[PDB]
Amino acid sequence: TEALYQVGKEFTSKMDLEKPNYIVPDYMPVVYDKLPQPPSHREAIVNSCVFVHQTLHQANARLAKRGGRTMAITPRHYLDFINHYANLFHEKRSELEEQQMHLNVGLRKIKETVDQVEELRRDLRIKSQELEVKNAAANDKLKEEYAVLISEAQAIKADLAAVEAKVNRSTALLKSLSAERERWEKTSETFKNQMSTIAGDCLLSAAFIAYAGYFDQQMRQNLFTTWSHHLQQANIQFRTDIARTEYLSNADERLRWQASSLPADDLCTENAIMLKRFNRYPLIIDPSGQATEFIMNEYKDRKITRTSFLDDAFRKNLESALRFGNPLLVQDVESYDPVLNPVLNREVRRTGGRVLITLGDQDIDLSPSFVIFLSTRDPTVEFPPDLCSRVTFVNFTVTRSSLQSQCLNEVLKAERPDVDEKRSDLLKLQGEFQLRLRQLEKSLLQALNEVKGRILDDDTIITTLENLKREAAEVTRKVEETDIVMQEVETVSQQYLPLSTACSSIYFTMESLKQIHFLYQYSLQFFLDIYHNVLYENPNLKGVTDHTQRLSIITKDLFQVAFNRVARGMLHQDHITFAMLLARIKLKGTVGEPTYDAEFQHFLRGNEIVLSAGSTPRIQGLTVEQAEAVVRLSCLPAFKDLIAKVQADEQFGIWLDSSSPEQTVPYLWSEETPATPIGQAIHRLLLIQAFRPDRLLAMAHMFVSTNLGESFMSIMEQPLDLTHIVGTEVKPNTPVLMCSVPGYDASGHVEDLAAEQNTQI
């Protein structure tokens, strides 16, 4: 902690972190034991910088204790952090001061313009007086030289006409510039507030770039909230309104990122910012592969080359990229070649006017435009701590919101192609429209910031402002009309929202199946193939034309195909577990059903309700374990009168020792309103677990039958139809994995399958 503080304080000396008005809080979140008792604002900032680094150690411990994969936290992360803090602070301070410079110039030109028309109106009145004097004098003299006098008066009349027209046009310009003058005044007042939060805002932003890349959406948010909370206890000022993506990137850059096929997702946008503001070279983790495409789209103009650590030309490609300064993308970083160790550590030797990098035993001149990106498609790969210290982790993990958007768009494309196309055109139109407005406000600001003397003196400046204002109003008119048409798109898309929620829940259930068996590995493409099958290769939609009925078919068939394809690659003992979860996902989709969260809370865990010796009595007709299950189940309001109901039922003994008690579970639960068939099954499920745990699987199958139908699990009972799956469902690039338990071997099935198809193998 002492080393971190000294590095932070020494490295932030160039920083302008002096706030004489800073108030020391009564409870100071001190992490450096020798931090001075009345800390200064700079002392608090460096103390907060130390705290952020130590939070990642706590963060890694929490994921490690839960079995999650963690990457080493090294001092190079801290050096990365403070480096970004210095750069962002200077960048944000420079941008704000530069912006405040234009606003002050723009405001003063408008104020001068208001003065100019005031004297020009005074001049207009003066010129009118001159006309009255000249006309009266000419008339009196008339009542050859007088012809010149009236010609002089007529010439002044043209001058007055030019003056009065200039007054009206400049007044209309001033009225047209009233909104811009008001907007610039408001921001100029807020200059002090923004200056007062840059120190805190950049600290949070820099920490996010240096540490948050490897973690998923939930863990990134937890880290930012922990840092934000600490700044509050330290009285460090930071704004809580602007999102981190908006504060670390402009709209122009985000527009180009979309053109480079970057997914429209906040975490993906955060990754793009990391891929732009990195200090250590980025290591990209993208199982889906859009990040690899995005990097290649972003760097075509700079001639980026894709290569791999396993390719034979990697050393030549690396040498060429270093020598010519071209971007290089290297894949398969799980096979990392330690030849990059000097490159990643930036171990350059500058002697004799030459910048040299030692690659193996050969010295190479390093061009300053060189950049290297490392990528892997395996999210589960472990890197050694030495590699973790040399790279910036940028993890592309699927978020629930992004998958919901992807699935909502895909069903819209399949089901409402006219609506989906209209949505796509509007987003392109609105993207261009917002782009144009930004240029319009920038150009209009530049015109007032580059004009000398007065605006009225040069009629060209006046015309340009009117044209920029005229185009600004029309585009603003075009934005309003695109807003209402999106409302037509949004209200159509609301019908397909529950399906997209089901899609994300199903995939994230599939993604969690690796926790119960190492074999249950499922990519996002596997689920997208399932989703595509339900939307485009569904025999139940052949003649259906009603959109609502098609949606019900799609929703039903999505659950069925998801179970069919996943369970063929699961052990049969785990089939009920996956079907149980799909039923719970489908139950959440039913608006008319209750949550049953308490009943499922009791169905799981359950044993955590500790019972004392006096808490559990001796119910005649039940064993000790059965009696305890009664007492624990008694905690629900529905089963509060559980012991009495069993005692009042002498026939309960017969049902307790029946072969199939799950099919005749007595109505032994109390309730106010009549329960639902799904609700009755859940009550029977709790009763069976309490009294006949050997029939819990049988009751679970009935629960799945109640939610998903009687034939939902029937495919697993049939022999595998390898012919249909290989011919239609399996892509040629996708290997077919024949996984068998000991004593079983699927080689013969493939050999027979080739014979049936009369194909060679």
XYZ file of N, CA and C in Angstrom, residues 315 318-319 322 337-343 347 357-364:
60
model
N 6.319 -15.230 -37.357
C 7.527 -14.458 -37.082
C 7.797 -13.451 -38.192
N 5.061 -10.755 -37.862
C 5.360 -9.889 -36.725
C 6.518 -8.949 -37.034
N 7.572 -9.467 -37.670
C 8.703 -8.623 -38.041
C 8.285 -7.543 -39.031
N 6.134 -4.841 -37.202
C 6.979 -3.985 -36.376
C 7.806 -3.032 -37.233
N 3.311 -17.146 -28.048
C 4.734 -17.301 -28.305
C 5.505 -16.282 -27.478
N 6.409 -16.707 -26.589
C 7.105 -15.747 -25.718
C 8.036 -14.804 -26.464
N 8.082 -14.918 -27.793
C 8.873 -14.000 -28.599
C 8.314 -12.582 -28.539
N 7.041 -12.427 -28.167
C 6.434 -11.110 -28.010
C 6.719 -10.451 -26.670
N 7.423 -11.123 -25.760
C 7.653 -10.544 -24.439
C 8.299 -9.165 -24.500
N 9.375 -8.934 -25.260
C 9.882 -7.557 -25.379
C 8.910 -6.600 -26.050
N 8.096 -7.081 -26.992
C 7.152 -6.201 -27.677
C 6.057 -5.743 -26.719
N 10.083 -2.911 -24.520
C 11.510 -2.834 -24.197
C 12.270 -2.354 -25.429
N 13.845 -2.644 -31.319
C 13.185 -3.659 -30.508
C 13.874 -4.989 -30.789
N 14.253 -5.695 -29.729
C 15.017 -6.933 -29.863
C 14.037 -8.096 -29.951
N 13.834 -8.607 -31.162
C 12.937 -9.731 -31.409
C 13.796 -10.973 -31.601
N 13.836 -11.825 -30.582
C 14.766 -12.934 -30.580
C 16.199 -12.449 -30.520
N 17.024 -12.885 -31.469
C 18.411 -12.454 -31.558
C 18.631 -11.386 -32.623
N 17.571 -10.900 -33.257
C 17.662 -9.905 -34.314
C 17.036 -8.602 -33.843
N 17.758 -7.499 -34.019
C 17.235 -6.184 -33.682
C 16.462 -5.595 -34.859
N 15.314 -4.999 -34.558
C 14.402 -4.480 -35.570
C 14.073 -3.034 -35.238
